[PDB]
């Protein structure tokens, strides 16, 4: 007896997104409405009236696609997702059997620009520039490190870490960069 | 405000009706009634011009639509149950512009039954004052005597009703109590006084 489904969707920036209605035969349905609430824009609707196959749209300026086929619910598509696409998408289907709902929280992910390099007096630097969300920088093995986060207006975050290791029996280090778009381990050879 | 709705507090095991009045120009297509639940809301019935009234199997012989219309809808429980107590939503679905809810909550009551036992012996008197209602009623003594012996006990039924019994043991109607002994019982903000006197002569 499911009538509502909340879902969080994560999409890499620049990649495809596809959003599906509650799963019901199109002959059964009466009215199907998509409701889009984007960051810093008002609510917004694309409606489809089944019996007469009519549509209406308050949704211009949101840069999304309404994909329709015969005898299937319409779906939302975004070929290449951008930051301004972040927000709330909801397909509201209603049949004589009542109201149904599928809510989507779309979050855009930015992979960080990662740079790394050795330095003066057995030091190293490791940077994950403007990723979303912020990445996390670890080291192997543990050294004398200072790590800082700067937030940018476009919701990206830069994380920068610099480390020293005093003179003993360590000559190779690893910068470990963890992020949803994929972790990586970068190797460095100390000066 | 978009939808006009009033919460309803009506009597248990009797008829109860909920109504929504949608105030707007745009004619809706279909009206849905749902029972607000944790998890998803539950679909109860729809009214549409295209399909008429459609009650979900679950509510088949428990409700009907009392007001057929896209602007004004009423649902009616024929004979309520504690299950039927809770919160309900009327959804107006209009082409081209989202939807509009109206939440109306239903609460069922049982009118109180009060027992008054007065028992007089040698000069002194003991009164017991029992009351069974839903919600629980409030017993208090207005023929005060500042002192006295007195205890109040309550019981909760598998019915859902709640009984409160207050035992007051007077020792002598002198400075103990005035010319009237009042058991006052409050039931949902309403007090009724039960007054007991005593006429002799000379
Ligand atoms: C998302 O999920 C829950 C449970 O399905 C639902 O009750 C709630 O209304 C949804 N959250 C919001 C903010 O709409
Ligand atoms: C949607 O509505 C527009 C403008 O009212 C109309 O031109 C078009 O034929 C309709 N298309 C579909 C696919 O429903
Ligand atoms: C949609 O695309 C236009 C380009 O025509 C751009 O100016 C606008 O910022 C975009 N809006 C959103 C919400 O992405
Ligand atoms: C986000 O802001 C940072 C800092 O200005 C920039 O490097 C990044 O490319 C910005 N824009 C986008 C679309 O990610
Ligand atoms: C990154 O590391 C975390 C633990 O720090 C791990 O749970 C996760 O699997 C890694 N992420 C990816 C995308 O492999
Ligand atoms: C309501 O239903 C109950 C059964 O649960 C029955 O005992 C009672 O007599 C009915 N009352 C009315 C007014 O229909
Ligand atoms: C209530 O609805 C049922 C359908 O389940 C129907 O059989 C009956 O005629 C209706 N009763 C009234 C009084 O409208
Ligand atoms: C809706 O209700 C009003 C009063 O609540 C009533 O007078 C009216 O007939 C109903 N509206 C319509 C369009 O019938
Ligand atoms: C009334 O009073 C006597 C004490 O005088 C006490 O023992 C008895 O339990 C009381 N009876 C009731 C029914 O409360
Ligand atoms: C009820 O008993 C308490 C002490 O247990 C006392 O303070 C109070 O005065 C009594 N009530 C009356 C009406 O005498
Ligand atoms: C409710 O039913 C219980 C039995 O479970 C009974 O003792 C109680 O007094 C009843 N109250 C009313 C108002 O019917």
Author numbering:
A (entry chain A): 15 to 205
B (entry chain B): 2 to 203
From the reporting publication:
The coordinates of CD200R were used as a MR search model for the CD200R/CD200 complex and CD200 was built in a map calculated using partial MR phases. The structure of CD200 was solved in complex with CD200R and contains an NH2-terminal Ig V-like domain followed by a smaller C2-like domain. The structure of the CD200/CD200R complex shows near orthogonal binding of the V-like domains of each molecule, whereby the CD200 FCC′C″ face and CC′ and FG loops form a concave surface that embraces the relatively flat AGFCC′C″ face and FG loop of CD200R. The CD200/CD200R interaction buries a total of 1768 Å2 of solvent-accessible area (901 Å2 from CD200 and 868 Å2 from CD200R) and shows high shape complementarity with a shape correlation score (SC) of 0.69. The interaction interface also shows charge complementarity with acidic patches on CD200R complementing basic patches on CD200 where a network of polar interactions is clustered. There are two salt bridges with K100 (FG loop) of CD200-forming salt bridges with E106 (beta strand F) and E115 (beta strand G) of CD200R. In particular F96 (in the FG loop) of CD200 mediates numerous hydrophobic interactions where the phenyl ring sits in a hydrophobic pocket formed by residues in the CD200R CC′C″ beta sheet (L45, A61, Y62, K63, T68, N69, and E70). Despite the high content of carbohydrate in both CD200 and CD200R, it is not involved in the interaction, with N-linked glycosylation of both CD200 and CD200R distant from the interface with the exception of N20 of CD200R, which lies at the periphery of the interaction interface. In addition to a disulfide bond between beta strands B and F in both IgSF domains of CD200, there is an exposed disulfide bond between beta strands F and G in the V-like domain. The distance between the last residues of each molecule in the structural model is ∼12 nm; this appears somewhat smaller than the 14 nm typically found for protein interactions spanning the immunological synapse; however, a further nine residues of CD200R need to be accounted for before entering the predicted transmembrane region.
